[PDB]
């Protein structure tokens, strides 16, 4: 479509040349669907999450849709993987999940790849 990644971070307004929160250059990551961008540290991503989100068509929080069913319904039930940030409805998982776990939850794609 008409998407172009924004050249500034939604959080600190800096470009990739200078994160205004950290005072260091830092690449931006950009939503594949809407083009909004953020510095990974402004997005509060770990370094390994930062690498992961650059490997697929990462979506921002607002655009995130479930990998399994494709919808963005039921925000309260759309889990975000703590290793790759992909979204999965708790009710699209099999077995489905009643409540977000405590501490990290990671998706089946990451379990397959890293373990």
């Amino acid at each position: 479509g008409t998407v172009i990644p924004n050249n500034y971070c939604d959080f600190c307004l800096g470009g990739s040349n200078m994160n205004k929160k950290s005072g260091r250059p830092e690449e931006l990551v950009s939503c594949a669907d809407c083009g909004r961008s953020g510095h990974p540290t402004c997005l509060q991503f770990t370094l390994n999450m930062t690498e992961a989100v650059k490997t697929y068509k990462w979506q921002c929080i607002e655009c995130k849709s479930c990998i399994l069913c494709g919808t963005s319904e039921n925000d309260d039930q759309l889990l975000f993987c703590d290793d790759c940030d992909r979204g999965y409805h708790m009710y699209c998982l099999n077995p489905p999940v009643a409540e977000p776990p405590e501490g990290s939850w990671s998706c089946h794609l990451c379990w397959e790849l890293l373990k």
């Binding site: 939604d10 959080f11 402004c42 925000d75 309260d76």
Partner: peptide
Amino acid sequence: ARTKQTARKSTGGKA
């Protein structure tokens, strides 16, 4: 764990 809802609430600086 994070959901879209809890992630929105803890990342309040996003434009």
